[model samples]
Target: NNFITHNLHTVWIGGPLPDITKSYLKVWRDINPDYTHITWIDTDNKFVALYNNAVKELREYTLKQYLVGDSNATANDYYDQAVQIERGVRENVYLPHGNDIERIKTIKKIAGSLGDNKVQEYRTKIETIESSFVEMIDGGHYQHVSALFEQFSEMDNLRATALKQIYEREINDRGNLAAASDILRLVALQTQGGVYIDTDLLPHIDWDLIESTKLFLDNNSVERVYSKEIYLEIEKYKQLTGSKTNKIRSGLTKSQINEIQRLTEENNLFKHLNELEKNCFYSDNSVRGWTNAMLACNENNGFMNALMDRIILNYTILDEFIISNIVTDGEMLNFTEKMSAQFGLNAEHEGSFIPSLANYYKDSIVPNSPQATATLFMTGPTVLDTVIRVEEAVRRGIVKKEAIASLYTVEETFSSWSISQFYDKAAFYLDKVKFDISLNSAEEGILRDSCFDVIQQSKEQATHLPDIAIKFLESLNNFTWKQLELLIKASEFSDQYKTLATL
Candidate 1:
């Protein structure tokens, strides 16, 4: 078959798979019994064979920039001071510390002889240095720097090691498991020709249908299902509504006609499609865009190759930019802004380069930290969505539409079916995950309190309401209470969610 192969690929790196993940895998295996299930605990050999030299060059370039600091002497000096300060504290060595006044005095002395424009630049540098210095002293900087040092210190040998070895090291040593998984999944699918699903996602749709599709990517939201059927429905609804509005006479009474109009207005399919089309695209940087969490493609697919190349190219360009332009205590470069400039496309997201050496550090020293967004733009759904949109544009006559068409979204494949029938609700639980990924403690507390307030208000309003409304309120209350119970369980399991429940 020229369709996607019946090879199911999933990745678990850094250590043994979690029990929850294993349970999901079991469900996947049970649902697709005839499929060849491949659990990638290491990088695929074929992927390494193809990309080894490119990765080798990237790794060497990264190490040389971070460890050797052959370029950017000012950045090197800042890095040196940061390392010395960190080491001194850990080893209990006495190091000189300066007060803010003294630091500012030094800054002023440095700027005293400079011209106006130069003085402005000097002041910015001093401000950045001061901010970085404070972070260093207050124990905010060491964790990231230590992690970087640990990774880079072994780079000389790592550079000579297999791409698989470096890939594994990125997960276990560098704390880049998520980012590594993103890269691995793309490479695995590209080389092996199959479907890849996240460990959290289990197959709910027909495996045969998925395998038969030439290409498909999951849409995170049901509204994101941009099918020809949806467009057709929109057109049909508009025509019917236009005819109804234009008619001067009817057999039905005015009230009956009004009721039909009301129902149509309430179920306005055209408006829904309008909103979905406006938001569900890469140009909008919509999270509702096609996701990498579940995708299927045939082996050596051109679209898959382009996506993998785009991801690596992003890293390649970003590494070079960081090495040459990024300075310690310099103004932080917004990750999306830089990528947008480099690629000539919108790249806005919750990702950024940390000031100082932190950008060179792994995503996080601990799991699920807010800093994890650093790599999300690099190899995650963001980049995947961008490529799909760009490829779709090219196929749709960006330059005469002569290219081969290969990419497809789930919505296009199963145009007549509801998304819930094809994917689990948890697959689209972006709101819940967004809290954990992007929200701070204060923001979470506020959100929890707001939820609590709504619940309280509903309870209070239920007392004076009619029986029908009260029953609806009770149903809502029951659903919300069940969610709260689950929230409590999640809190007990994770300290991250614990703060949310405290409200």
Candidate 2:
């Protein structure tokens, strides 16, 4: 039965990636606890160790989820237990920490995405999460390893040990991050019913809206938009970084600005950038790219179980390439792309980066791999999207196509706002902060420049500017900085605006 527990259990998974910040985690903490049970899964365990005190002080309704059995259980077993809850939010967003400013900005947007009805419920929760959202300078306040063992032991012994090993190996290995994050989500959802929200996502309504088992983006319209958005942001970033004068003049470090310029350079950048635009991972026949970002299922979901098994079996880098319509350079060094293209491998035949790169570089593929393209596909969306297509065919009877919700994008969830309003804000943020850590330095430059430039221009004006521009500038909460920045940047006074040209 698809039961809606009066108190929903939510699961948040983050790890290994140091970028996951307290502010980002705070969003999870801020979800209306009156109806949600929050569990923070420290897959890497390092985060839990890092944010020791704050996480410990969270409300009683909140719990920590980790795999305990170490060398004892296979990755399958570890994942099987990760999402074993029956209610609330379950996120497939692999929380990569580091970009605190942008991460917090997004958290605000997600919060902004919620309805007025939720505002009251959220205030109290946000307060708690914010109080603890601190950057630890060192391990001075960190609890010892034994304490960690004790805290997670309360969650489960088997999972605790498994998580410990994952933490240890994570220092040297990154291969498992993508596969493990995807696999664990399915296992947890199948056995334990609940809603899943990618860290990059949020809903306008309450999570309880998913009281039944439903794949959030069955048609994957959002995935298509998001996939396109990545390329668009790249183009935008390239344009912004095109000028050497701008790069040198911006407030960012010289090296940081230089790197942006290097990545933004046309020939070198376009080689990798254009290749990612093609939809090779999903299928030519498929309209949806299947998003695992936000999915919910009833307890003991057959479809989820089936999906989990397939995910476990195919959790290798080699499998990722094969599934995503890619093949390594096997027999013929120059023949890989031809093989992918000739057979029309997967649904996407032409633009498969894996094959394209393999064929182009031949023996030197791994080192020259396009980090973003390969990483995105390997992790949540593409693999899950591909797997769903495969599984739906093999186990059609297990899933109810009609029951699945119509494909809804994260933007759609915030439907209270008009379409134009959504994209307007989106462009501002995306253009500024393209890839989290990848664009952090660049984003800072744009943001800092935008702010300083605007303020100086304001001063240059006759003690004031347009009312709208002034209002937006005055409402400069970091929470709405991008939105505010958009308002100010687009204001009529932009022409008179100063640029970040000097120290």
Candidate 3:
């Protein structure tokens, strides 16, 4: 029986991309040999094969288990906690009513064709849930968005009411869904009581290394805040001769600029004349800094419950900034989408705030833009960071400094904070494959190149990638390189290939 608080309650969230490779399993076994892997999934079934195959392969590593939740899982799989691969991206948000097509398909795969009456019964049930969902948001056509809150409430009605407090209230928006998941992680753990590992994380140390912190600091997160240094750089470019015409000039000469601009247009910055307005208004919202990668707690944990309370409180103040302020560009022409509107533009609204928070969201910035600072702050770790510090205030009222010390005990869960380290050891990738076709092409190409390069480079540099990386490369299609230069580069970078990075 499980005696300690931690077992392989380890959850793996998979999207449609690469299947679970041996590298992931190897690293996991090495980190914690006892991991009884329990993969968690949303509505995608395309990833089932990956898990199914992974479970079969992982027998050598550990006794793996499975859990399928929400729209994508079958009654059998959900009931049994087993595998099949669901190939898709964008985790289905927990919903009041979600589509049953995929669920039915998954069910059919597991159970075979049911009687006609049985099919109808399942369809009818799914339809009823859908209709109820439509009613919950009052047919707003924003079923997904509405579910974000409605489902939160469903999980814990108390926190649901508390979240409503943050309704008009704001947290930073980094235009990423990670923000919402951060809240969900806290709530789910407190309510059901378990570990919440972000899809990207791989274990470096065991639960035995677990620890906590009352207030997480932002010293490690944010890259930079709007500043005079960046300001002078932008202005200096703007002051250039020919540069004055098109907009956004910089030290990177036209050739360098052109190459980068092409790359920006291709895979993945610029300024305005919000020049003074942005520089003068940077906020040190350090509360928005912390890694929301892996969190663990016992069921109905007091610390996590209290943390949820603090999140609601912080949201009230955080909301005042992102709700409806009109942020405008400096009218200085333009550049790439990621450039802060603050760069060359100013908000006509006299008191606009561009808090230097990493993961907050702003209504002013749209998602998918490079200039997604608002999106970043809101969805990024900013809110989580902010919540912890603010919660410390409430905790101070209870246990003073001891309150701060009491939480954050599960530190080893996040000891391998570096993506590089995680790449080397994670049991799986949250985004195992590129679900989006176009993105997938680029990703697959990159993966192909990376593995090929590792092999090629191992031969060239008189060195070798870990044998595991080499074996992984050989298992795929014939490793061929399109561009010799990039292939060579891949080989050089092979040693660094983690989930998100190559070299």
- Backbone Cα, N, C clashes tallied per candidate: 0, 18, 70
Q: For residues 55-167, what per-residue lDDT tens digits would candidate 2 score against the true structure?
A: 11221112222322232333334223322321112121432322333233333444344446434443454444434433331312122333444564564455445544443
Candidate models: Cα lDDT each: 0.40, 0.34, 0.33
State which candidate has the highest TM-score: 1
Tens-digit per-residue lDDT, 1-503, candidate 3: 22213322323222221122222333334444443443322332223322233222332122122321233333333212211111111122321111234434443332223244544654554455445434533621111324444655776787777753343122111112234344545544444443445433333211111112111113442112212112223223323222211222223334443433342233212211011111110112222234444454455445556566645544543444335442345321221121235333223421222343222422222112322344333433444444455446334532111100011111122211112211211112111321111123444455555555444443322222334444444435543345344444444333333222232
Q: Which candidate is the best by lDDT?
A: 1
What's the lDDT for residue 165 in model 2? 43
lDDT of 1: 0.40
TM-score for each of the candidates: 0.40, 0.36, 0.34
How many backbone overlaps does candidate 2 show?
A: 18
The best-first sequence of candidates by lDDT reads 1, 2, 3
Better of 1 and 3 by TM-score: 1
Who is ahead in lDDT, 1 or 2?
A: 1
Tens-place lDDT digits, model 1, residues 77-186: 43343334333322332211122343344335434433366457556655554454354346310122223223433642332133334354444333355666666665
